[PDB]
């Protein structure tokens, strides 16, 4: 009926290597993806680090520029790729997606994962 975001509880990636934080859903007829955001939990408050909208991709903090991508081309796959993982990258990440509904308004879903960085 309404789309369901799929994000695992935790992801573990190699220090100074790369990792994929999955965020996927089964696309439904009549649901149009209008926004994707990835946020990171710095403090008690999430801050946006990636935004995809009608004008494309926007990387919102300077330390991610050239490190952060959402590159899968499969519809419904908005997984986050972070290259050269740092200790500082250990945090909780939110994947948030906004769709237009068949009825003309919008619905939004989000899900939190914990990123662990392994030596």
């Amino acid at each position, epitope marked *: 009926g309404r789309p*369901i975001l799929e*994000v695992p*509880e935790s992801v573990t990636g190699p220090w100074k290597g790369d990792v994929n934080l999955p965020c996927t859903y089964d696309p439904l007829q009549g649901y149009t993806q209008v926004l994707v955001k990835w*946020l990171v939990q710095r403090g*008690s*408050d*999430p801050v946006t680090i990636f935004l995809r909208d009608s004008s494309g991709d926007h990387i919102q903090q300077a330390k991610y520029q050239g490190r952060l991508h959402v590159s899968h081309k499969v519809p419904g796959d908005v997984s986050l790729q972070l290259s050269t993982l740092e200790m500082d990258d250990r945090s*909780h990440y*939110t994947c*948030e997606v906004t769709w237009q509904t068949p009825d003309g308004n919008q619905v*939004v*879903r*989000d*899900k*939190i*994962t*914990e990123l662990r960085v392994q030596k």
Partner: nanobody
Amino acid sequence: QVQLVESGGGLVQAGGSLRLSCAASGRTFSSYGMGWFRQAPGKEREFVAAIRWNGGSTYYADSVKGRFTISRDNAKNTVYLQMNSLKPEDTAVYYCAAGRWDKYGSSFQDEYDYWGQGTQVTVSS
């Protein structure tokens, strides 16, 4: 992976107050939006209240808005449901629930992965 246990249910009189608690196992409690649902005799389970992982943003069913307040203490792995101005139609089994939603969908059972067994609240006339 998360086990939930509700406590503090019981028999209370109409007009009274009752405070429920739900304790979570694990060391990821900060990662979870927490919710209360309830189910009365013969009726389907319905949303009551939810609270974001950081505390602060809270969400309520119109039926209990204002009368009930949800809170959490992340240091203690506990969510609370302060039920004020109780009415007999509040009688139900109350379930604690946990999901990894951040800001959205908190009113929907399907957004929650883990459930307690529930605790009985009875408000007498």
